[PDB]
Amino acid sequence: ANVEIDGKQYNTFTEPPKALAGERAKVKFPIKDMTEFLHGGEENVTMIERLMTELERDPVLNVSGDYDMPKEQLRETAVARIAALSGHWKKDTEKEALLRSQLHGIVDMGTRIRLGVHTGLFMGAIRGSGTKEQYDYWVRKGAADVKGFYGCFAMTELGHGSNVAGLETTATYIQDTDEFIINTPNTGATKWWIGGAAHSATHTACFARLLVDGKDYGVKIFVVQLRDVSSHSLMPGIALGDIGKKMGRDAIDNGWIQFTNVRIPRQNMLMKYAKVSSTGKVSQPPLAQLTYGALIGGRVTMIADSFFVSQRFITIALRYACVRRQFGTTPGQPETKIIDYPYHQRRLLPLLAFTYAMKMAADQSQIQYDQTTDLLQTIDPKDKGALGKAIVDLKELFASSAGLKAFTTWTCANIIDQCRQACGGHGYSGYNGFGQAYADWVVQCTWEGDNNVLCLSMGRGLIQSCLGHRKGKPLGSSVGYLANKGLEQATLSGRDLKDPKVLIEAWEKVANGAIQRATDKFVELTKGGLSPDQAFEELSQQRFQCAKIHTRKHLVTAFYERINASAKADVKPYLINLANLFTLWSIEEDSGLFLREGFLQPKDIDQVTELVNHYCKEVRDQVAGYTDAFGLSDWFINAPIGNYDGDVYKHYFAKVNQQNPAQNPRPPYYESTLRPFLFREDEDDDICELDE
Amino acid sequence: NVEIDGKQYNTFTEPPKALAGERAKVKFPIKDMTEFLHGGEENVTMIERLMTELERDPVLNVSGDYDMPKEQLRETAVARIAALSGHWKKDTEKEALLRSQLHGIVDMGTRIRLGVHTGLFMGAIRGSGTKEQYDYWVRKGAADVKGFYGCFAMTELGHGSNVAGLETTATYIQDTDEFIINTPNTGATKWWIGGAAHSATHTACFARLLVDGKDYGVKIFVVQLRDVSSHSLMPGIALGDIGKKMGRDAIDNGWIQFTNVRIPRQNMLMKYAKVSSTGKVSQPPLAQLTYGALIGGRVTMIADSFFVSQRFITIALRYACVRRQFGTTPGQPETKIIDYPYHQRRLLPLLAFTYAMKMAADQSQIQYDQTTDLLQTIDPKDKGALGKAIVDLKELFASSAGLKAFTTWTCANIIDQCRQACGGHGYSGYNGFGQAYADWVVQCTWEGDNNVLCLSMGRGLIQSCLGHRKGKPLGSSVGYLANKGLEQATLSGRDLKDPKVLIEAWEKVANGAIQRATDKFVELTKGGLSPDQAFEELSQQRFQCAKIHTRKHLVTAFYERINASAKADVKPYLINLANLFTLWSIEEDSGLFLREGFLQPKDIDQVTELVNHYCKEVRDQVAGYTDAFGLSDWFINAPIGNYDGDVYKHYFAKVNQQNPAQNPRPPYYESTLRPFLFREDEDDDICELDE
């Protein structure tokens, strides 16, 4: 059958652009103001618009044909891509450069990192850990401009990743020559996963145990030249190779490295923090402005990346959903668009809410970090209690960072995966991006701190924060709710579940509950004679749960706080609608936490279910506005079913035929392989003669 | 550095010795655990024989597959079909399926490319052809793939799940005794048709049967796509390669359009629906269309989930036994990650789930064979005994659906989790995770979209609830719905290590969800909503019903198969697994059991302590549970997963073999890298202007 809209008849092929226009027609807010909320104002929006257009327009950058590229071409084109991006280094501010590389990561996660290993990790190490004179030297050798020089970052070993303190590569001081000997003692200590090392890097920042006169001073950082710059040949004692095929991100040339008795000058050790004299005396000064703006910054960047990737796929799935019809139960009626189904709304709309929430947690973290850094600077008289609070605010920021990184990276993975399923078998088309994006994304969970290892540390960290509070230490701003003793007795008490203040309190309750009980058990177990370490091991599930509940509560809090703080009036009700869906959905997913603490009873879960259904419908009405608010052009979407105009089948059929021209019906292997098989001769079924 | 048996090992040298240590702890004969997993000694030797015939065959060697581009995968799949074809003359139906599933532990692309002819096309002409039609197509080369290659065109760009809504039309023309097959719009383009782009000469085309302006619904028609001699497209046929997929690139999925294609009437497959030479349409009742194929298919998928899951769980666990990261005692070596309680939690319940998927597969097959016989036996029928066989059947379909959905999603999850359990090394293509996950996941979308199956199931469970309420009979699978005691049952201080108590907890929670959503449905229908609008209003509830019932089914099936088939030497160790599975399952969905009031908050702490305990008991025997799968290094196909445990040495070797390192510079060094590193400086000059 056929659909009639505005006096005209449509078919399965022609209806989609009309359906999606119909959705746009419902939008009650101006989209520009929703885009200002996501990116923190007008100035930021124009900047992002500028950067996005610069990327998309660049001919060498074009991602349109990347799905069909084998690894050798990904490897080659990433270099050409680097040469093009290299034009902006002269011009860009740090903020511009970071944001340009994150925007570009929406569609090319390989090139960004292949540059990134020099641009951030190697340059980060020489700037972060070298003296001014050491930095300036490497820059004169061409390291800032990537001129006859290309760095990489060699920390990970085949045997050690998470436990950096346990690296086995050694750097042995020899006084006679004033040198370090860099040595890989067994093949287990071979450097591993080193981006750029396989084919690109002339130098590395090598992490090795510092050994002077039989004393082990722990892991430090040494510049080791990997290749003769002139010929790209390996320096003496340097072995390295391409690690080969990865799940994803094949454009990056991750290599292994072995060092055998490689001689470097003492001066190649980076010495801002740890210093070694020409006589072999080792010093490690107090160095108070050690403040790891960088550590928080690295995590805030990844929390934002989770946003930047998620918005693409959630946009693809939702636009598809607005036009895709499957099934109906009316004789006279067309099949229902899947967006109209309440189950499908539950699959996608919370994740749309989740993606907005990811950005607010990145923004809230960067802002809390900025006010806390600014607060330290103002207080010269050093009112000590005040400084102590500013320090624990900063400490708890770093700690909260670990959970946010862990969960927003996992969540981004789940969204890519879910959005793919939501588009059915057309999810499995390489051109709709799900496959490649998922494969590329997933490493974010492993590198920059294993997600599970971060969650267990932060879970231990919360128990230590709670126990130190009980002993009279002040709590950092991020875990202040642990001091709130109104939560012991708190219950819903017939309050409104549509009120953000209530839903906030409910996440404070279950976080506090889990952490106080875990801290109590840790105390029973230590008194019982376990060491601190053995007690934390006994409480591995509880530490993980604490990390999880606290992070969830932080996402909820940051969403509401940022709405209250920065949302213009015309968008505010639609954001609260999003926020309530996020928050009530989250409650619904983890109903047990709420039952067990006694905040809700069996009947209140039913009500929560009804509210999630309700906000699903409120969010669904405005869905085109929420998704168009991301401001992604079709180039960033990079999937036919997700294009702005909504002509899902026309573009998809176009994309397939463009990349797969159909004029020849037989495969390249038809004569060689397929034809010989289909036309094979019959078996010889004679049997040998034998008398009798 | 570590000392074992008075000898020195390092990070590189230890791992083979560590894994041998774990084998030393095993308290059962591993061969009996294999017998349990595969239903006894005979099946096991058949499996062994098959696996070895696959491993040996040089054409099928999968060692270099990860590095292979799409063009290679496509060609290679055909060479592999040629080699696998050597077994068609001799295999039984049992051996052929099994050989094909075993093969798909390592090559998800080839079995499907063969499969579309082998299973889908042949299945349609056998299933829906008359004997004469079948024999005709066999005579033209179909059975033997001689001058003939089939595919299955059902899906259209417009329709996947809603098969009844397909738009492609078959119009009968008496004058010429022909159907006209036609694709009315581009939306109706057949899509995802494996074999079509490059391989297939013929398709089983699903189209609406139109006779005299009467639409008789979707039927099946054989349509020649290509001239056999030249492989060129036939008049009115347009097809093309769909191109890059997330996975399974070896399969040549195509799109197809039909433009007034004429086929003889006799090409319509006429076992159930017949059209005469005058346009007389007949559809006799005909025994209900034999859905053992439909159930049979879901059972296969459940097993496939076991067959893949075992591989990745084995790789991850063997890795976990040798990998040391972090230590707490200043003097000692770093702790092997398998000794971390949180690592145990991530993997050993998945290992348990792996076994459980098999049990549910085996259970389903048995129940379905058993019900099928108790239909033949009842040639003479007594009103009550024919009715419950029918109702046990219906409840088998529903149970099949949830099982397929959740076991396939679980297998995806297992793959993903095992990859993260191996850290960075999980992201190497050579350790299998990336490609397996990319290939596997489509199982969640085809053969019934997993979400659509769940929402059907949960509607079905509600309807069975309403049925019983109104005096209708209950299928065995949903019997717990008739249990009076359940409504007020509580833990009441009973042992959580007792399987029976755990069964009751799961029965209570499933029944609780179903009955409650039934009351909601009745109340909403009373309110005046139509049956279908109320289900839609209850969509959360239908899903939740399906998940809960399916989880419960997995639990009971595990215990039931252990009690039915576990010898004494392995029983305690399988109850340990089963218990871990069931208690971990309770911990993961604690809110359900709090909400029905079976458990109190105090009981949730005890479940957590028991998950911790059963993790320890299962950890001790890990080598036994994983070796029992009986996979050789060829099936593992991952360096860190190898039998000997020499994880670093195999891994460094695999990498270097595939990536010879003798040349330091990339193939683009002169063309691309070298001109960038040594590019000339910017021109800083500024145009002259007096002013």
Ligand SMILES: Cc1cc2nc3c(=O)[nH]c(=O)nc-3n(C[C@H](O)[C@H](O)[C@H](O)COP(=O)(O)OP(=O)(O)OC[C@H]3O[C@@H](n4cnc5c(N)ncnc54)[C@H](O)[C@@H]3O)c2cc1C
């Ligand atoms: C594509 C890619 C590129 C990379 N590029 C670089 C690079 O350029 N430079 C570089 O230096 N590194 C690089 N790495 C390495 C990466 O930083 C590490 O892989 C990661 O930080 C740690 O992983 P691992 O392999 O050390 O695993 P491990 O730390 O050994 O952990 C392995 C598994 O064991 C578990 N585990 C570990 N410790 C514990 C514990 N105490 N308790 C419980 N469970 C535990 C973890 O959860 C994990 O699942 C790269 C990795 C990848 C995948």
Ligand SMILES: Cc1cc2nc3c(=O)[nH]c(=O)nc-3n(C[C@H](O)[C@H](O)[C@H](O)COP(=O)(O)OP(=O)(O)OC[C@H]3O[C@@H](n4cnc5c(N)ncnc54)[C@H](O)[C@@H]3O)c2cc1C
């Ligand atoms: C690799 C591959 C190979 C294939 N090979 C073949 C082949 O050889 N032959 C062949 O005939 N077909 C083939 N297919 C097609 C495949 O069977 C379909 O993709 C699948 O069966 C149906 O999904 P769909 O794309 O039609 O999505 P739809 O049915 O539209 O579903 C899309 C999304 O909408 C949601 N949705 C749909 N209906 C509802 C509802 N009522 N309520 C709630 N949510 C709903 C679904 O959950 C799904 O997430 C292949 C597919 C793939 C991926």
